């Protein structure tokens, strides 16, 4: 069964790498619409679905442990066509775009930290990448936006400490870009990796929303940060 | 599979030649492995022709006081024109002021009075133009001496200044 | 004379007459850039201790780098060196995918 949550003003990211002073800039790009219904998945018993992409994904998560530990993107999630894999070790992220023979229920397996329960073939990858943090920089919300345009995968991320609330709090925080990968891959399906500790897990929960082509009006203050935005097709005001 | 020979006392034509075959292809990706752009140092406080990682333009480079967010390369002002960049090599923020300019007008009493003339360069500093070099506050008058007396307006120069044929 | 040319007359009465435009040209040029990064080592493929035999040849796929071909010009006389689709004097200013 589904379970929805109202995302009030979430998923506003920096559109370009340009400094702007106290300026109201009107942009038109893929944004998650204001006051929308994001889907609140649990996957905890263990049932994580293979969701579509369609135009980017806003992905929020509230987990103090390390369970939501990467993603799987692709078009058939099989061999004979390529697919992207983001795994997230304790020290570094390893993005890998190979012809993975993905298993039915993919998960990592920690004691030792193995990989053979995710896939079973790694033939002919043309892209590798290693960066340090990517994750974990009361509870802390972690928000990501993935969008694949013109062969470029763009991941935007922001990790913010929040108080106890609806896990998508009433406020505003702009998402700053993380990587920009030249993959050259058709991406239409994705799902999330987990770790299972060797069977038994904790309690996962992630919020998935979909980006749409919208016109926004962002307001940059003196220091070049975004403090407010207005969705030009929400209400009358 | 027959083994080669490769004794050292073979003629050139039976010697082991190593071979590397490079094959370049340009298939789909908008950006991949590419050669190295050249880099010539930058001059400060001079009107130069600049290129900052793709941004092509003209202007004077000066030390800035703006603060970019680690992911931003350049800034634009109101009216959407680039006004600051970050040097790719040294990672410093520099403002871009444009090369001075403005109209040039000639003040003449008429050839039936005299052939002298003075020239005002509108909001041009008298150090960036290329006797009597007065610096009005609405140009940069050359060819007339500025006095502290006052007379009736003759040839209006602008901003409460004037010129005229006297002695 | 520039004023007389602007008015298209030979008599210029009293007053400011706008004639021309003053624009400053730029001294020279300044192309600056970022230090450096990956250099996609040819060295390995042009200096291996054991080349593979001809029926079972290697195939190194070269990923993202800046590719200075000026090197590869410090190995010998190269009994050959035939570039086919490209001309070898222009290699340092082109982008390739694979
Ligand atoms: C790019 O490389 C240059 C190499 O010249 C770096 O410049 C040096 O940086 C160190 C660290 O602060 C200084 O101690 C040196 O004095 C600098 N060299 C000179 C000639 O001033 C530069 O910092 C590098 N930039 C980045 C972003 O890594
Ligand atoms: C090709 O390989 C040889 C051997 O690895 C390199 O020779 C080395 O050169 C460096 C610097 O010139 C010396 O410090 C080493 O002692 C050398 N090693 C040996 C075993 O002689 C040679 O430089 C390589 N070619 C290039 C262009 O790097
Ligand atoms: C979210 O879902 C509820 C119930 O399904 C619905 O009443 C509401 O209108 C939805 N929100 C939007 C913005 O459509
Ligand atoms: C994660 O991967 C990197 C290299 O891929 C490795 O150095 C590191 O040890 C791995 N993390 C763990 C916990 O094994
Ligand atoms: C990668 O290698 C496999 C060999 O199994 C081949 O089928 C595939 O076409 C190769 N990928 C590309 C992009 O050529
Ligand atoms: C990607 O999609 C486009 C259009 O949807 C299609 O033309 C192209 O063949 C696809 N590429 C692959 C590798 O499937
Ligand atoms: C951010 O802006 C405030 C004023 O709104 C200022 O006091 C503060 O110094 C700025 N921060 C930085 C790092 O410049
Ligand atoms: C200008 O010179 C002409 C003779 O060339 C004369 O007739 C006229 O009066 C002069 N004008 C003035 C203002 O002196
Ligand atoms: C012209 O530049 C000099 C410094 O070179 C400065 O002292 C002077 O005030 C400037 N004039 C104007 C009108 O700005
Ligand atoms: C005009 O008077 C001011 C003081 O009001 C003085 O500073 C300036 O030097 C005088 N100009 C001339 C040309 O004497």
Question: How would you class C30 by CB atoms within 10 Å of its CB: exposed for 0-12, middle for 13-18, buried for 19 or more?
Answer: buried
The whole-angstrom separation of Cα A6 and Cα A37 is 5
Asked if residue A124 has its Cβ within 6 Å of ligand 5, the reply is yes
Question: How would you class A97 by CB atoms within 10 Å of its CB: exposed for 0-12, middle for 13-18, buried for 19 or more?
Answer: buried
The boundaries of the domain holding residue A146 are: 4-237
The whole-angstrom separation of Cα A82 and Cα A123 is 9
- Which residues 35-54 on chain B approach chain C with CB closer than 8 angstroms? 35-43, 46-53
CB contact under 8 A, A182 and C98: no
Contact status, residue B128 vs residue B100, Cβ threshold 8 Å: yes
SS3 C5: helix
Ligand in nearest proximity to the CA of C59: 5
d(CA B95, ligand 1 centre) in Å: 21
Query: What sign results for the dihedral spanned by CA atoms B147, B153, B159, B164?
Result: negative
Query: What's the half-sphere exposure (Cβ side, CA atoms, 13 Å) at B144?
Result: 23
Phi, psi of A128 (to 5 degrees): -135, 155
Strands A140-149 and A57-62: antiparallel
Say yes or no: A15 contacts chain B, CB-CB below 8 A.
no
SS3 B104: strand
Residue nearest to atom 8 of ligand 9 (CA): B125
Residue nearest to atom 20 of ligand 1 (CA): B90
Asked if residue C98 has its Cβ within 6 Å of ligand 2, the reply is no
The whole-angstrom separation of Cα B75 and Cα A21 is 8
Chain A: list its partners (3+ Cβ pairs within 8 Å): B, C
Start-to-end CA distance of chain B, whole Å, equals 109
The whole-angstrom separation of Cα A95 and Cα A114 is 16
Q: Which of B18, B61, B101 sits opposite C23 (nearest CB)?
A: B101
* Residues of A whose CB is below 8 A from B76: 18-20
Say yes or no: B46 contacts chain A, CB-CB below 8 A.
no
The whole-angstrom separation of Cα A148 and Cα A155 is 9
Q: Which helix (H) or strand (E) holds C95?
A: none
- List own/partner pairs for A117-125 with CB under 8 A and 24 or more apart: A118/A72, A118/A85, A118/A87, A118/A193, A119/A85, A121/A79, A122/A96, A122/A98, A123/A79, A123/A98, A123/A99, A124/A98, A124/A99, A125/A82, A125/A96, A125/A97, A125/A98, A125/A99
For residue B84, give every residue at least 6 positions away whose Cβ sits within 8 Å of its Cβ, in sequence order, or none. Answer: A19, B64, B66, B68, B74, B75, B93, B94, B95, B96
Asked if residue A7 has its Cβ within 6 Å of ligand 3, the reply is no
CA distance B24 to chain A (A): 15
Residue nearest to atom 1 of ligand 5 (CA): A124
Resolution in A: 3.1
CB contact under 8 A, B72 and A151: no
Contact status, residue A11 vs residue A145, Cβ threshold 8 Å: yes
Query: What sign results for the dihedral spanned by CA atoms C43, C46, C51, C52?
Result: positive
Closest of A52, A115, A62 to residue A86, by C-alpha? A115
The whole-angstrom separation of Cα A222 and Cα B50 is 27
Q: Which residues pair with C73 in a beta bridge?
A: none
CB contact under 8 A, A19 and B30: no
d(CA A94, ligand 4 centre) in Å: 9
CA distance C29 to chain B (A): 4
Phi, psi of C7 (to 5 degrees): -70, -20
Q: Which residues pair with A71 in a beta bridge?
A: A86, A192
For residue A41, give every residue at least 6 positions away whose Cβ sits within 8 Å of its Cβ, in sequence order, or none. Answer: A3, A48, A49, A205, A206, A207, A208
Say yes or no: A126 contacts chain C, CB-CB below 8 A.
yes
SS3 A19: strand
Closest of A190, A91, A192 to residue A136, by C-alpha? A91
CA distance C97 to chain A (A): 10
Q: Which residues pair with A114 in a beta bridge?
A: A109
Per-residue DSSP letter, A221: -
Say yes or no: B159 contacts chain C, CB-CB below 8 A.
no
Asked if residue A47 has its Cβ within 6 Å of ligand 7, the reply is no
Annotate A47-105 with DSSP letters as a single string: ----EE-SS-EEEEEE-SSS---EEEEESSSSSSS-EEEEEE-SS-EEEEEEEEEE-SS
CB contact under 8 A, C91 and B87: no
Longest dimension (CA), chain B: 110
Closest of A130, A145, A129 to residue A59, by C-alpha? A145
The whole-angstrom separation of Cα A72 and Cα A105 is 12
Say yes or no: A176 contacts chain B, CB-CB below 8 A.
yes
CATH number of the domain within which A102 lies: 2.60.120.960
Q: Which helix (H) or strand (E) holds A4?
A: strand A4-7
Overall size of chain C counted in residues: 98
The whole-angstrom separation of Cα A57 and Cα A32 is 9
For residue A154, give every residue at least 6 positions away whose Cβ sits within 8 Å of its Cβ, in sequence order, or none. Answer: A145, A146, A147, A148, A177, A179, A180, A181
d(CA A124, ligand 5 centre) in Å: 6
Distance of CA A186 to the CA centre of its chain: 17
3-state DSSP: chain C helix, strand, coil percent, rounded to 5? Answer: 15, 15, 70
The whole-angstrom separation of Cα C85 and Cα A148 is 32
Q: Provide the 10 A C-beta neighbour count for residue A150.
A: 10
For residue A182, give every residue at least 6 positions away whose Cβ sits within 8 Å of its Cβ, in sequence order, or none. Answer: A127, A151, A152, B29, B30, B31, B32, C64
Q: Which helix (H) or strand (E) holds C6?
A: helix C2-7
Asked if residue A123 has its Cβ within 6 Å of ligand 5, the reply is yes
**Cα angle for residues B19, B24, B28 (degrees, 5° grid):** 155
Query: What sign results for the dihedral spanned by CA atoms A176, A179, A183, A185?
Result: negative
Query: What sign results for the dihedral spanned by CA atoms A94, A99, A105, A110?
Result: negative
State the virtual CA torsion across B30, B36, B37, B39 in degrees, nearest 10.
150
SS3 A224: coil
Distances (CA, A) of B14 to B3, B4, B10, B11, C77: 13, 9, 6, 6, 18
User: What technique determined this structure?
Assistant: cryo-EM
Query: What sign results for the dihedral spanned by CA atoms A50, A180, A7, A173?
Result: positive
Annotate A139-204 with DSSP letters as a single string: -EEEEEEEEEETTEEEEEEEEEE--SSSSS-SS--PBEEEEEEE------EEEE--B---------
The whole-angstrom separation of Cα C66 and Cα C86 is 18
Q: Which residue spans within chain B are E strands per DSSP?
A: 47-52, 55-63, 74-76, 82-86, 93-97, 101-108, 118-121, 155-156, 162-163
The whole-angstrom separation of Cα A163 and Cα A165 is 6
Distance of CA B148 to the CA centre of its chain: 39
The whole-angstrom separation of Cα A12 and Cα A171 is 11
Annotate B63-101 with DSSP letters as a single string: E------TT--EEE-TTS-EEEEE-TTT--EEEEE---E
Distance of CA C53 to the CA centre of its chain: 38
Contact status, residue C40 vs residue B22, Cβ threshold 8 Å: no
Closest of A226, A142, A136, A144 to residue A179, by C-alpha? A144
The whole-angstrom separation of Cα A127 and Cα A98 is 8
Q: Which residue of A has its CA nearest to B32?
A: A182
Pocket perturbation via mutation, ligand 5, pick of A96, A99, A151 by most ligand atoms within 8 A of CB: A99
Contact status, residue B118 vs residue C19, Cβ threshold 8 Å: no
The whole-angstrom separation of Cα C93 and Cα B36 is 7
Asked if residue C43 has its Cβ within 6 Å of ligand 2, the reply is yes
For residue C66, give every residue at least 6 positions away whose Cβ sits within 8 Å of its Cβ, in sequence order, or none. Answer: B33, B34, B35, B36, C36, C37, C38, C39, C40
The whole-angstrom separation of Cα A206 and Cα A135 is 14
Give chain A's domain count.
1
For residue B138, give every residue at least 6 positions away whose Cβ sits within 8 Å of its Cβ, in sequence order, or none. Answer: B120, B122, B123, B157, B158, B159, B161
For residue A25, give every residue at least 6 positions away whose Cβ sits within 8 Å of its Cβ, in sequence order, or none. Answer: A217, A218, A219, A220
CA distance B1 to chain A (A): 28
């Amino acid at each position: 069964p589904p379970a929805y949550t109202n995302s009030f003003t979430r998923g506003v990211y920096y559109p370009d790498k340009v400094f702007r002073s106290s300026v109201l800039h009107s942009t038109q790009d893929l944004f998650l619409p204001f006051f929308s219904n994001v889907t609140w998945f649990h996957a905890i018993r263990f049932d994580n679905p293979v969701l579509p992409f369609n135009d980017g994904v806003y992905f929020a998560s509230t987990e103090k442990s390390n369970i939501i530990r990467g993603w799987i993107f692709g078009t058939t999630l099989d061999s004979k066509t390529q697919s992207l894999l983001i795994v997230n070790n304790a020290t570094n992220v390893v993005i890998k775009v190979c012809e993975f023979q993905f298993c039915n229920d993919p998960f990592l397996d920690v004691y030792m930290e193995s990989e053979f329960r995710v896939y079973s073939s790694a033939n002919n990858c043309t892209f590798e990448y290693v960066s340090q943090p990517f994750l974990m920089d009361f509870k802390n919300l972690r928000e990501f936006v993935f969008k694949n345009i013109d062969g470029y995968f763009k991941i935007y991320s922001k990790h913010t400490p929040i108080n106890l609330g609806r896990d998508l709090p009433q406020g505003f925080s702009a998402l700053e870009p993380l990587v920009d990968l030249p993959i050259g891959i058709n991406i239409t399906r994705f799902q999330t990796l987990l770790a299972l500790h060797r069977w038994t897990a904790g309690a996962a929960a992630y919020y998935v929303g979909y980006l749409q082509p919208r016109t926004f009006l962002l307001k940059y203050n003196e220091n070049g940060t975004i403090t407010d935005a207005v969705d030009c097709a929400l209400d009358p005001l | 599979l027959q083994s080669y020979g490769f004794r050292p006392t073979y003629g050139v034509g039976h010697q082991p030649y190593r071979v590397v075959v490079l094959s370049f292809e340009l298939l789909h990706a908008p950006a991949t492995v590419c050669g190295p752009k050249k880099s010539t140092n930058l001059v400060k406080n001079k009107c130069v022709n600049f290129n900052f990682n793709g941004l092509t333009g003209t202007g004077v480079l000066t030390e800035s006081n703006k603060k970019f967010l680690p992911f931003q390369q350049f800034g634009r002002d109101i009216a959407d024109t680039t006004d600051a960049v970050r040097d790719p090599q040294t990672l410093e923020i520099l403002d871009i002021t444009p090369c001075s300019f403005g109209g040039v007008s000639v003040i003449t009493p008429g050839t039936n009075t005299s052939n002298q003339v003075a020239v005002l360069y509108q909001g041009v500093n008298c150090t960036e133009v290329p006797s009597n070099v007065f610096q009005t506050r609405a140009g940069c008058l050359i060819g007339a001496e500025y006095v502290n007396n006052s007379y009736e307006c003759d040839i209006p120069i602008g901003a409460g200044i004037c010129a005229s044929y006297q002695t | 004379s520039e004023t007389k040319c602007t008015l298209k007359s030979f008599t210029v009465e009293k007053g400011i007459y706008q004639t021309s435009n003053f624009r400053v040209q730029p001294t020279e040029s300044i192309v600056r850039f970022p230090n450096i990064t990956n250099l996609c080592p040819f060295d390995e493929v042009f200096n291996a201790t054991r080349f593979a035999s001809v029926y079972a040849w290697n195939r190194k796929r070269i990923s993202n780098c800046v590719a200075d071909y000026s090197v590869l010009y410090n190995f010998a006389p190269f009994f050959a060196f035939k570039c086919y689709g490209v001309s070898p004097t222009k290699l340092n200013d082109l982008c390739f995918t694979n």
